[PDB]
């Protein structure tokens, strides 16, 4: 009778956190959190750390308004998990060639405009090393960013994970 396929995605307006059922042990051992519950409770472009693994991080950004210019010495990535996000790119004349982590690029970065990418939910884009990139959101969204722990990375484990 019903043949309707319904693939379920969450969003900031509509998410249901999963559940950890403990039988012996401790829920804290699983660092269990929801990205959408995290962005709903964070400042615009606070890079919240949800995965930490030998210094590599997965960060959740709440996309709202316009971000700082960001840069790094190595590739990073973004998946737009909810919302609509415009990413703006600049090829730095003098890129950091060393270090690790995502860093603030400055107020007025120096380099040639490379253009922009228009990301809706489900879309991934490359944040190439030695460029500076900026985020603009007209409608609150959620950004997943893959990268290495740095200055802008915030850890609030107690605040985001089951205990």
């Amino acid at each position: 009778s019903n043949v309707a396929v319904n693939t379920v995605f969450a969003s900031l307006d509509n998410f249901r956190k999963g559940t950890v059922e403990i039988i012996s042990g401790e829920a804290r051992h699983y660092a269990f959190s929801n990205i959408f519950e995290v962005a709903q409770n964070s400042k615009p472009y606070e890079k919240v750390v949800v995965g930490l693994n030998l210094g590599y991080v997965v960060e959740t950004l709440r996309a709202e308004g316009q971000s700082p210019w960001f840069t790094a010495a190595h590739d990073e990535f973004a998946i737009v998990m909810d919302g609509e996000v415009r990413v703006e790119f600049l090829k730095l004349d003098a890129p950091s060639k060393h270090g690790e982590g995502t860093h603030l690029a400055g107020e007025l970065p120096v380099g040639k405009p490379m253009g922009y990418v228009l990301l809706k939910r489900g879309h991934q884009c490359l944040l190439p090393a030695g460029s500076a990139y900026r985020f603009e959101a007209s409608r609150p969204g959620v950004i997943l960013q893959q990268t290495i722990k740095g200055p802008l990375s915030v850890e609030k484990w107690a605040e985001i994970c089951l205990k």
Binding site: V20, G51, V58, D75, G115
Partner: protein, 324 residues
């Protein structure tokens, strides 16, 4: 690399195989593994389907890390370059009966043998990589081959799919019946003049929507040792995994349920349900198995840092990632 196999069985049609002590033969319904312990030959039977599905993941992942169990008796353990094939060694009751057996092998030989066992036991009617609903039966007498399914050619991903010298996107493959409502829109990329093809973005969801395989993490983005390896899950994870290092999952669509128990006897530790947007760390001291009713989109996050096992043995890294 030289595979001891027999001639095709008179009735059955299938070849039987030798691997060290281990004898591997199959018939109309079961794979049957044979090993020596306590002076007699011990046997074990696994439904052909269960068996092939697991062996397929074993081959595909190159024996993975930690303990890969086809079931409560048979499994493998990759000591990198060398692989253990074991029977009951990590089943409490067998270990204690003294009926268990293990034997090491050089990777290239056990691979040659497993790849061979698949080529011969996978009829033209069965696809080990698919969910049940998607495919025919693994049962009966030998009936053609399915080279196309057990021998998938992939270009390794270097940076991200869709880049020129990299792995391809999937625009030429059908959207999977169970992902029929996932938007197939691509991101808009407006390059400035002089920079055409210097920026890249694709649709991850469109990508996974077109995945023809099941429970097979594949790399979609590389950040040094940090790898993103999304996969699409349907039914039951073909093996139960005994972990070796911490693993991280980010559930991107629908839901999966995870069974979690002690790496040995299986004392339930937890039962995890991950809904859309959930992030979970699986400890290195447990084993786990996944159940997923509708084909779902899961993101597996790997760390390809090579000295990882040293770290866990030293206590430089604890079983669970975070003290909070």
């Amino acid at each position: 690399d030289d595979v001891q196999a027999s001639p095709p069985h008179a009735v059955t049609g299938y070849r039987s195989f030798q691997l060290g002590a281990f004898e591997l033969s199959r018939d109309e319904y079961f794979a049957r593994i044979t090993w020596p312990a306590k002076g007699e030959t011990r046997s074990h039977l696994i439904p052909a389907d269960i068996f092939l599905r697991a062996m397929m993941r074993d081959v595909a992942w190159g024996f993975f890390y930690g303990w890969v169990n086809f079931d409560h008796v048979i499994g493998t353990r990759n000591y990198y370059g060398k692989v253990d094939l074991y029977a009951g060694t990590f089943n409490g009751t067998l270990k204690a009966a003294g009926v268990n057996y293990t034997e090491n092998f050089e990777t290239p030989l056990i691979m040659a043998t497993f790849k061979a066992i698949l080529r011969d036991w996978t009829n033209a009617t069965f696809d080990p990589f698919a969910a049940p609903e998607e495919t025919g039966s693994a049962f009966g007498r030998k009936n053609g081959e399915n080279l196309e399914c057990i021998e998938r050619f992939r270009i390794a991903t270097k940076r991200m799919p869709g880049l020129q010298d990299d792995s391809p996107l999937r625009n030429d493959l059908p959207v999977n019946r169970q992902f029929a409502d996932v938007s197939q829109d691509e991101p808009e990329v407006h390059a400035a003049e002089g920079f055409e093809g210097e920026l890249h973005a694709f649709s991850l969801f469109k990508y996974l929507s077109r995945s023809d395989v099941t429970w097979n993490p594949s790399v979609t983005s590389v950040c040094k040792a940090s790898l993103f390896c999304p996969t699409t899950e349907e039914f039951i994870l073909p093996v139960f995994h005994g972990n070796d290092r911490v693993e991280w999952f980010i559930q991107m669509s629908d839901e999966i349920v995870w069974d979690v128990g002690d790496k040995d006897d299986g004392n339930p530790r937890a039962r995890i349900t991950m809904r859309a947007g959930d992030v979970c760390a699986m400890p290195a001291d447990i084993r786990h198995q996944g159940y997923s009713t509708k084909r779902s989109m899961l993101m597996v996050w790997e760390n390809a840092t090579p000295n990882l096992p040293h770290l866990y043995e030293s206590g430089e890294l604890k079983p669970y990632p975070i003290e909070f």
